[PDB]
Write a protein that binds this ligand. Structure first.
Ligand SMILES: [Cl-]
Ligand SMILES: [Cl-]
Length: 691
């Protein structure tokens, strides 16, 4: 019965933790006894603790800021160096905050979760932090001149000293003495998805009990957030308030903070349009749906720009709106990023990165200039601020390590850092291929292998996908997969299945809700194609997915067990009947359908893994992972799958429950390292990697 299962529903406490510890210990001892473990451990530790790891960063006021972890500092160091030093192989870094020292002090893992700098006094930062991998977080104000926390500064503590935490509580500076944030002051100030439901404004020197509530959303909404509408260099007083109603639709507002009285004014934009950035007084918005705007049908996936004042106006009064991107068939929007005098528009065309830059001249958008990316199958990233003329760009592909480039004030890329580690890209092949799905639709996939392998169906192969939430699953360079898997003659595959965002909102909507089986079919189409082409065979084929991808792979192995030889189901959502009861489950009703609506439940039960398991069926060996402090999906999902599968004597399972990773691989570097040693030992042993 579910009475037998009920103890596992409690994340912490007693019977669940003991049950989980025992299975985890059995699993770790079993992995540690496999012939492949010693070698896999060596290879992973060499990578994770490598002093030649690339120190990625962001430029502010003549310095590059970096966050660094290694075996000495697994929680990590927030640090900086002069931009002139950043080109040196081994820059002289100034350590700003040592999180390992902080953790030792408090007696708990304190994880760095980002920073926000004050425009009015740029020596002041709000440092975001969490205990381990919790979604709940807090912050502390910190001063650069002092290189220390500000005594009695902004930190969400009560008049007894009690620290208040909230899931993705992040603060925004109003002025040097005022912040706004999504504070959980009272226990009940949360939505049904358990995110903070309120925004508070808080003045320096006042108890948090004196903070003024400015905004509250209904319980049925997902979350509320505050952030800046424009660059602080244009306005520090316009705040964007975003109330996410049902994951995809929003009520958004401008909060103007500079007048005698605060002013809150509702933004008139399509409810599923999203703010993507700004430049000067203009704002960029992405469309998820077609917009009939005056004469025009502006297609779903387009980017428009408008003056911020037109956000408050009726369609009749919206004179500044311009269309900046209209995707052709294989195109999708990626991001906007801004410098002092340029806007960068990053897109994909057939899952290959493309970038242009433009500006404003005489209040008109200039003709964009192509920024040529000198990699095949390029993947693009960058950090920048409108306050800064210079920016750091990365370009990479799945088999070529990332290069970091400085964007200089004369508007060109200059190489600033190459990888210090060695990876001989010419010994590998990267192919972009397509499978044909059940309905004739072509599904992209990326295939990476070592030159010289035979296509005789005996290559150990690891196939990954995600397939949800309009997420673009781009083929980035993975040092771990390339060096631990592909260098040992394993094959790597990434499938851009529907549910994702690789071809814009329609690519997502096609496998959304009760259409989820479309995502799963896409994944089978790729799996079968790998086998047909004698890249691999079921015995050598492993599949890996996390979170939403954890549903994907548990569905795959239960519908099509005969296609696969090994599975890793990581921090999964998978109990699709009961998902609303656990963690942030209410937030995804529009993604999966509502199990309490008969028609949605009927579709969900056709695929839900716990509804489609047979005791007498051999399933592929599976590694299931979850965490006590996973507040996103809750460990129930991993625990119940293990509990039920454990009872099938035809199936071998490995289970790993982490104390404090949360929704991820580990909340410090050592724990992540151990997680990937366990995972790669599992696959190497299951699929016979020659290691
Ligand atoms: Cl930073
Ligand atoms: Cl102060």
């Amino acid at each position: 019965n579910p009475k037998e299962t009920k103890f596992l529903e409690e994340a912490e406490g007693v019977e669940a933790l003991e049950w989980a510890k025992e299975r985890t210990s059995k699993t770790e001892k079993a992995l540690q006894a496999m012939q492949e473990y010693k070698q896999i451990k060596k290879e992973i530790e060499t990578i994770f603790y490598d002093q030649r790891k690339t120190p990625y960063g962001v430029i502010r006021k003549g310095y590059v800021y970096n966050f660094w972890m290694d075996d000495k500092n697994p929680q990590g160091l927030w640090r900086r160096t002069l931009v002139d030093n950043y080109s040196k192989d081994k820059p002289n870094w100034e350590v700003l905050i040592d999180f390992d020292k902080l953790s030792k002090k408090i007696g708990k893992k304190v994880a760095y979760r980002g920073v926000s700098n004050c425009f009015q006094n740029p020596n002041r930062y709000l440092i975001s932090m969490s205990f381990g991998g919790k979604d709940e977080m807090f912050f502390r104000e910190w001063d650069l001149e002092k290189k220390d926390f500000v005594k009695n500064g902004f930190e969400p503590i009560t008049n007894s000293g009690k620290l208040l935490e909230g899931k993705f509580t992040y603060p925004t500076w109003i002025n040097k003495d005022t912040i706004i944030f999504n504070l959980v002051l009272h226990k009940n100030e949360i939505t049904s998805s358990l995110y903070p439901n309120s925004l508070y404004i808080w003045k320096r020197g006042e108890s948090i009990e004196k903070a003024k509530k400015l905004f509250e959303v209904p319980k049925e909404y997902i979350y509320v957030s505050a952030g800046k509408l424009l660059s602080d260099t244009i306005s520090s007083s316009l705040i964007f308030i975003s109330a996410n109603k049902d994951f995809y639709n929003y009520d958004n507002y401008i909060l103007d903070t500079k007048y005698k009285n605060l002013k809150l004014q509702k933004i008139n934009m399509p409810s599923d349009a999203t703010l993507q950035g700004s430049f000067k007084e203009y704002v960029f918005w992405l469309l998820r749906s077609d917009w009939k705007f005056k004469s025009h049908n502006i297609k779903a996936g387009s980017l428009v720009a408008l003056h911020f004042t037109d956000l408050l106006k009726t369609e009749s009064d919206k004179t500044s709106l311009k269309i900046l991107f209209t995707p052709t068939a294989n195109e999708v929007f990626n991001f906007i990023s801004t410098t002092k005098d340029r806007v960068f528009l990053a897109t994909y065309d057939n899952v290959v990165a493309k970038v242009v830059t433009f500006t404003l001249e005489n209040e008109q958008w200039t003709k964009p200039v192509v920024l040529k990316l000198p990699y095949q199958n390029a993947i693009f990233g960058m950090s920048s601020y409108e306050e800064e003329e210079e920016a750091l760009i990365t370009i990479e592909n799945s088999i070529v390590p990332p290069t970091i480039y400085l964007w200089v004030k004369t508007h060109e890329l200059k190489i600033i850092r190459k990888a210090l580690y060695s990876f001989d890209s010419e010994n590998y092949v990267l192919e972009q291929k397509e499978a044909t799905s059940f309905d004739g639709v072509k599904i992209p996939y990326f295939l990476v292998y070592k030159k010289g392998i035979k296509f005789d169906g005996k290559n150990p192969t690891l196939l990954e996908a995600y397939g949800g939430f309009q997420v673009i699953n781009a083929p980035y360079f993975s040092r771990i997969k390339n060096e631990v898997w592909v260098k040992n003659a394993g094959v790597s595959v990434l499938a851009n299945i529907r549910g994702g965002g690789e071809f814009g909102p329609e690519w997502h909507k096609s496998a959304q809700g009760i259409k989820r089986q479309t995502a799963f079919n896409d994944f089978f189409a790729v799996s079968e194609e790998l086998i047909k082409q004698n890249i691999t065979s079921p015995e050598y084929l492993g599949i890996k997915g996390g979170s939403n991808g954890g549903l994907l792979v548990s569905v795959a192995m239960t519908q099509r067990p005969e296609l696969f030889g090994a599975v890793a189901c990581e921090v999964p959502i998978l109990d699709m009947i009961r998902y609303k009861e656990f963690g942030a489950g209410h937030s995804w009703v529009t993604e999966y359908g509502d199990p309490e609506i008969p028609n949605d439940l009927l579709h969900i039960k056709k695929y839900a893994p716990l509804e489609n398991l047979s005791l007498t069926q051999k399933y592929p060996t599976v590694l299931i992972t979850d965490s006590v402090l996973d507040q996103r999906v809750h460990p129930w999902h991993g625990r119940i799958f293990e509990y039920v599968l454990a009872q099938n004597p035809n199936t071998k399972t490995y289970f790993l429950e982490s104390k404090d990773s949360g929704h991820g691989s580990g909340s410090d570097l050592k724990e992540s390292a151990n997680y990937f040693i366990n995972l790669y030992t599992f696959f190497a042993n299951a699929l016979k990697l020659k290691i």
